[PDB]
Design a protein around this motif. Sequence first.
Motif, PDB file in Angstrom:
ATOM      1  N   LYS A  63       0.854  -1.284  -0.007  1.00  0.00           N
ATOM      2  CA  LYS A  63       0.034   0.063  -0.176  1.00  0.00           C
ATOM      3  C   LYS A  63       1.035   1.339  -0.085  1.00  0.00           C
ATOM      4  O   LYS A  63       1.472   1.489   1.130  1.00  0.00           O
ATOM      5  CB  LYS A  63      -0.880  -0.239   1.119  1.00  0.00           C
ATOM      6  CG  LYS A  63      -2.167   1.084   1.273  1.00  0.00           C
ATOM      7  CD  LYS A  63      -2.914   0.934   2.576  1.00  0.00           C
ATOM      8  CE  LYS A  63      -2.152   1.935   3.708  1.00  0.00           C
ATOM      9  NZ  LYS A  63      -2.348   3.180   3.308  1.00  0.00           N
ATOM     10  N   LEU A 112       2.589   5.127  -0.427  1.00  0.00           N
ATOM     11  CA  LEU A 112       2.242   6.466   0.144  1.00  0.00           C
ATOM     12  C   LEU A 112       2.881   7.443  -0.338  1.00  0.00           C
ATOM     13  O   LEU A 112       2.586   8.618  -0.380  1.00  0.00           O
ATOM     14  CB  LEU A 112       2.571   6.151   1.782  1.00  0.00           C
ATOM     15  CG  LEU A 112       1.755   5.478   2.810  1.00  0.00           C
ATOM     16  CD1 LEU A 112       2.640   5.183   3.879  1.00  0.00           C
ATOM     17  CD2 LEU A 112       0.659   6.159   3.278  1.00  0.00           C
ATOM     18  N   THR A 113       4.203   7.192  -1.059  1.00  0.00           N
ATOM     19  CA  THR A 113       5.020   8.404  -1.716  1.00  0.00           C
ATOM     20  C   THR A 113       4.729   8.023  -3.397  1.00  0.00           C
ATOM     21  O   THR A 113       3.763   7.519  -3.779  1.00  0.00           O
ATOM     22  CB  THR A 113       6.339   8.165  -1.369  1.00  0.00           C
ATOM     23  OG1 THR A 113       6.393   7.847   0.059  1.00  0.00           O
ATOM     24  CG2 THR A 113       6.952   9.436  -1.248  1.00  0.00           C
ATOM     25  N   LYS A 128       0.872   6.012  -7.518  1.00  0.00           N
ATOM     26  CA  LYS A 128       1.050   6.776  -6.200  1.00  0.00           C
ATOM     27  C   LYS A 128      -0.362   7.335  -5.466  1.00  0.00           C
ATOM     28  O   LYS A 128      -1.184   7.534  -6.426  1.00  0.00           O
ATOM     29  CB  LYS A 128       2.047   7.903  -6.708  1.00  0.00           C
ATOM     30  CG  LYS A 128       1.687   8.902  -7.875  1.00  0.00           C
ATOM     31  CD  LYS A 128       2.649   9.968  -8.049  1.00  0.00           C
ATOM     32  CE  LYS A 128       3.825   9.756  -8.963  1.00  0.00           C
ATOM     33  NZ  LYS A 128       4.588  10.860  -8.805  1.00  0.00           N
ATOM     34  N   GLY A 129      -0.340   7.683  -4.339  1.00  0.00           N
ATOM     35  CA  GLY A 129      -1.310   8.044  -3.769  1.00  0.00           C
ATOM     36  C   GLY A 129      -2.247   7.104  -3.180  1.00  0.00           C
ATOM     37  O   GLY A 129      -3.592   7.187  -3.266  1.00  0.00           O
ATOM     38  N   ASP A 130      -1.911   6.114  -2.340  1.00  0.00           N
ATOM     39  CA  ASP A 130      -2.624   4.911  -1.581  1.00  0.00           C
ATOM     40  C   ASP A 130      -3.271   4.386  -2.612  1.00  0.00           C
ATOM     41  O   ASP A 130      -4.526   4.175  -2.713  1.00  0.00           O
ATOM     42  CB  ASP A 130      -3.666   5.565  -0.318  1.00  0.00           C
ATOM     43  N   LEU A 183      -3.450  -0.310  -3.600  1.00  0.00           N
ATOM     44  CA  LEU A 183      -2.967  -1.400  -3.233  1.00  0.00           C
ATOM     45  C   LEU A 183      -2.478  -2.200  -4.515  1.00  0.00           C
ATOM     46  O   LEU A 183      -2.945  -2.193  -5.483  1.00  0.00           O
ATOM     47  CB  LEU A 183      -4.109  -2.280  -2.858  1.00  0.00           C
ATOM     48  CG  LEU A 183      -3.648  -2.970  -1.256  1.00  0.00           C
ATOM     49  CD1 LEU A 183      -5.105  -3.480  -0.334  1.00  0.00           C
ATOM     50  CD2 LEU A 183      -3.097  -4.386  -1.727  1.00  0.00           C
ATOM     51  N   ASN A 190      -4.848  -3.090  -7.695  1.00  0.00           N
ATOM     52  CA  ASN A 190      -5.882  -2.412  -6.874  1.00  0.00           C
ATOM     53  C   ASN A 190      -6.898  -3.976  -7.144  1.00  0.00           C
ATOM     54  O   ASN A 190      -6.543  -4.894  -6.690  1.00  0.00           O
ATOM     55  CB  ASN A 190      -6.642  -1.480  -7.771  1.00  0.00           C
ATOM     56  CG  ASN A 190      -5.738  -0.272  -7.448  1.00  0.00           C
ATOM     57  OD1 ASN A 190      -4.587   0.020  -6.962  1.00  0.00           O
ATOM     58  ND2 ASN A 190      -6.312   0.979  -8.149  1.00  0.00           N
ATOM     59  N   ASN A 242       7.567   4.695   3.152  1.00  0.00           N
ATOM     60  CA  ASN A 242       6.996   4.869   1.595  1.00  0.00           C
ATOM     61  C   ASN A 242       5.689   3.999   1.452  1.00  0.00           C
ATOM     62  O   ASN A 242       4.900   4.321   0.464  1.00  0.00           O
ATOM     63  CB  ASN A 242       8.013   4.799   0.669  1.00  0.00           C
ATOM     64  CG  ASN A 242       9.072   5.738   0.632  1.00  0.00           C
ATOM     65  OD1 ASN A 242       9.645   6.212   1.983  1.00  0.00           O
ATOM     66  ND2 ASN A 242       9.330   6.358  -0.334  1.00  0.00           N
ATOM     67  N   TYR A 243       5.782   2.813   2.230  1.00  0.00           N
ATOM     68  CA  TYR A 243       4.818   1.554   1.759  1.00  0.00           C
ATOM     69  C   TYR A 243       4.350   1.085   3.019  1.00  0.00           C
ATOM     70  O   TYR A 243       5.254   0.949   4.077  1.00  0.00           O
ATOM     71  CB  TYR A 243       5.126   0.688   0.757  1.00  0.00           C
ATOM     72  CG  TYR A 243       6.424   0.327   1.133  1.00  0.00           C
ATOM     73  CD1 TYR A 243       6.605  -1.088   1.744  1.00  0.00           C
ATOM     74  CD2 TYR A 243       7.497   0.694   0.608  1.00  0.00           C
ATOM     75  CE1 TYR A 243       8.011  -1.427   2.013  1.00  0.00           C
ATOM     76  CE2 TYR A 243       8.960   0.132   0.818  1.00  0.00           C
ATOM     77  CZ  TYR A 243       9.136  -1.001   1.524  1.00  0.00           C
ATOM     78  OH  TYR A 243      10.405  -1.525   1.798  1.00  0.00           O
ATOM     79  N   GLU A 244       2.927   0.521   3.154  1.00  0.00           N
ATOM     80  CA  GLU A 244       2.459  -0.310   4.144  1.00  0.00           C
ATOM     81  C   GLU A 244       2.180  -1.725   3.692  1.00  0.00           C
ATOM     82  O   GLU A 244       1.302  -2.078   2.891  1.00  0.00           O
ATOM     83  CB  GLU A 244       1.250   0.180   5.023  1.00  0.00           C
ATOM     84  CG  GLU A 244       1.483   1.312   5.784  1.00  0.00           C
ATOM     85  CD  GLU A 244       2.259   1.132   6.872  1.00  0.00           C
ATOM     86  OE1 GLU A 244       2.040   0.214   7.722  1.00  0.00           O
ATOM     87  OE2 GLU A 244       3.245   2.214   6.984  1.00  0.00           O
TER      88      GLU A 244
END
Lengths: 299, 295, 299, 241
Positions: free
Chosen positions: D162, D164-165, D184-186, D188, D200, D229-231
């Motif tokens: 996921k 974030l950057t 970019k911008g959340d 999956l 996605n 940067n990511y989850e």
Amino acid sequence: MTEHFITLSTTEPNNNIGIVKLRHADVNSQAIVAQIVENGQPKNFEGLQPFFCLMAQEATGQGVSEESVVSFDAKNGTLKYVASDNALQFVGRNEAYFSFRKQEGGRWIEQFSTRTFHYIVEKSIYSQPFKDSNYWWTFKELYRIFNKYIEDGKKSWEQFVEANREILESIDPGGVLLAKVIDIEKIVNEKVPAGFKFVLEHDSEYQPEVKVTSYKNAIGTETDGFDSGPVFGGGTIYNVPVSLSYDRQKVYVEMPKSYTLAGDIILIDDGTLLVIKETQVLCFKMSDAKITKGYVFVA
Amino acid sequence: MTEHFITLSTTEPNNNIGIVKLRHADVNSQAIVAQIVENGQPKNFEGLQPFFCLMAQQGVSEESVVSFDAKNGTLKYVASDNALQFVGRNEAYFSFRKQEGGRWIEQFSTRTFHYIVEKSIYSQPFKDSNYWWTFKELYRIFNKYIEDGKKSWEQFVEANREILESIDPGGVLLAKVIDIEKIVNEKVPAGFKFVLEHDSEYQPEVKVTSYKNAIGTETDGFDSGPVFGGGTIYNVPVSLSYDRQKVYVEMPKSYTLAGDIILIDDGTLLVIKETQVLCFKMSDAKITKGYVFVA
Amino acid sequence: MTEHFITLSTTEPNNNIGIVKLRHADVNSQAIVAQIVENGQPKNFEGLQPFFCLMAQEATGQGVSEESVVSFDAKNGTLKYVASDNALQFVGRNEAYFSFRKQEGGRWIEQFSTRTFHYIVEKSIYSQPFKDSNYWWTFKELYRIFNKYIEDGKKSWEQFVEANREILESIDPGGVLLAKVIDIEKIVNEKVPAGFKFVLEHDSEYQPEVKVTSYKNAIGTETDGFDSGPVFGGGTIYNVPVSLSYDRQKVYVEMPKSYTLAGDIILIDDGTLLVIKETQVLCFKMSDAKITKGYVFVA
Amino acid sequence: YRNLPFIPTSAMSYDGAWLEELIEGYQTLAVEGREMYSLSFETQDMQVGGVITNVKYPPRELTIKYKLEDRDPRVLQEKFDTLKAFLIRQEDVPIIFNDDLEYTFYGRFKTADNVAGDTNSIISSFTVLCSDPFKHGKIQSVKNKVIEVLPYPVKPDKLSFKLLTEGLLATDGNYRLKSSQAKKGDFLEFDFQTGDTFLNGKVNNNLLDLDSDFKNIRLTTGTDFSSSNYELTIQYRKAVL
């Protein structure tokens, strides 16, 4: 809390596959999260109350073990059962399953159940028997006996004093007078500011307020060194009743005769003075003035 | 009353003792007889009263034991509703107390033991080991015959003592016969017989109606009767008989009427005697002649 | 409810089917969905009632089950049998099959059976107690009690009549009313339904109207052959009074005692049935429904 | 009485079902090969000693000793016909043992040892070849880093990223997973190890990963991917030999 995930079937002949392991001492934490599946699709048990059925070893009958599951979603076929004290009572290798019934009242109508899964419970420090006083015990057994000694001991003492009171108290027309007087004599010795007088010299020209407190086993006053006393950092703090008397730069603090303590007088940098005799400490706190000298009153 | 005889110890833990199963909603008073032992020998609890103590499952309850032998150390505990509360393995023990100062104080107690509480779920009329649909239908049919039969016979006996044994046979017999006589002469079509000749080769349906004070049949001319256009119209019960181009219409004795026979220009015929009119309506055929049967 | 999909063959052994596993205390949940196959193709058991047959254990000779299957599709050859208490009697392996039979009265007309299959019953926390079968004892006792009613009923009636004998002799002098009641019973035996009951089975789900007619010497019924009777075509046609009673696909036709005729039942392939005894014919015409079977009522 | 099916201590669950439960008279006597594993070695010997070129992990086969008995010879033959039909499989099958219920093997029936044509009570053995010699435990979903005691490096099952950057650059020190011009911008990113990649909701195999990205990543007992940067949600199964 700890969760245990299982995907239980009602069609697939598993019988024993699907392991879940817990231990004796796990009050309300270890919960079983189960997904009910029939023919590869999630099963809707809407209208049917889920039940945790446990087939415990050497504790079988007609109702071996059955507990109603409170947390559940019948629409998606999901449930969360938290293991109870009964569930964890049987230490060993057990078999369990989940039942679903549409009970009308006494008699049932529809009751479908999931395949059996292994429900094994590991021993704890509490379940394991240990040798004490050349006898074998468990924690719960001793804890019950000790708490019984406390409960029965206090009832036995309450009655000892009460019975011994009525011998002197009721059986005599003038004996009530004797008993009453001793009681008053003690309340005056403990609650009334009487037999103890202490002088506090100050810098102020006015009447500074003095607050007196008494406590035993304070920080660094215990008999066997630091943190050797029964209550760390000071036992019980008693607000000493005081009768204040004032002269020029002198405060006469009158206290009950029970708080009479002849020890070492220690003066701290500010408006605070202590009287320490071994463990017993008598604290003097003065506001709006600085203590210069402290001593017991003499005539 | 089911009994469980066991031996309890105060020194050694009670776990090797026999398995004790107790029913939940049992009719019989379940009892446990226990021999108190201190170091493997009986203990005399003279002056002390035994107490059954149940552990939390919350569920802490203390119960006084009524039946006990203080000299030999044999106590008999009755399974109460509080003892048979939780279904499963229950933990309990016996404590011996002496009341001093209006409160019971424990002297010594036996070590905890486990007892299992069994559930009474399945009903007394148990299902048979073997089930046969054929045998359970054969019983159904046979029992139906014997019951429906007895009911038919019991109805017959009851109706006999109602006439014969009850009131006065003579009078009652005449009364009902006259009542049946009146019914068959008003409802059953037997007494009166009428013939209707027709043009059809088949069996035409005939419907008979009886009415008084009809249009133009009143005593004092037109609109002189109590109900204008005709009185009550009665549907006459008929038992039809057929021959070639002839219908034999049978009617009850009360509907007998020998009057003027009027044939209308269609499938309708009337028999008029003053005010009383007997109508004969015929479907899918035309009436050619109408007359009372004489043979 | 749980569905177990299996395919059963009549001509092939049912060894390749999966493990059919079902729990002991399940009441009305465990449905066995069986597809019937004969020589590879589906079998149409149209007009045959499916039966669950559970064979007893050879050791004890207990646990036989003969059950009528409720839900089934004869056209495609599928059935859905819900496990019963008797089905789930023994914990462990069980040997059962399916029977399909046609019944008229009490005798079997045709029956075919699927090859035996095996299913396993899992242990539950509950164990249903089963009483030893007493079919014969229940049947004997019902027969003995009914014969005790016969014996005691005859004795009670004999004493009743004999006690009221004097009243019964003085009930009617000579026979004035008896001669009047004989005249009245001749009307009741001919013009109203009394003691002649005929059953007509139909295809309709409703209550079809039935019309009964009685006639002698119709075409092909005359004693000396065709056109030998006095009236060619048939004699007098009598409209028979009827008291119609209805059950599911059954019409109970009550008729007067005079119309009692026990002969040959001839069914034309529509809403018409005949009872012919020599020259006498009793015709049964039915509206908006087809007659399947006709017979005189017996109880 | 009750004819209860007996399940031995070291019973075998082939495709979720017990064979001893399936076939009456069948009993698993012993299971060999799972308790001890052998390694394959490539050695380039020289004048003194010899260096190891490559270490291989051969696919192991587990030998299953069984006993099938029936009084009737005709039924006995039918019993085997059912046994063979169940064992002989075209694809790999999940195998669990009654003594080691925690793990799961993934193999297939291979060869059966010689079987006698008399007695009516036959004891034989058959072998089950496991393409993957590792037995896998339960499936676990862990966020960012794996801290569990892993006995062997584990290849994951699913990697749920996921962002974030701007771009995706997953690293643990050894493996570098690159995705230039990512969503970019959340948004999956699914990286299903036992299949293909997803973006996605839709399947995006062609664009998702960059040319210098890794899909041969292995998880050790102390693998960390945690970044601002990511989850990441790692999905793996404990592998043991």
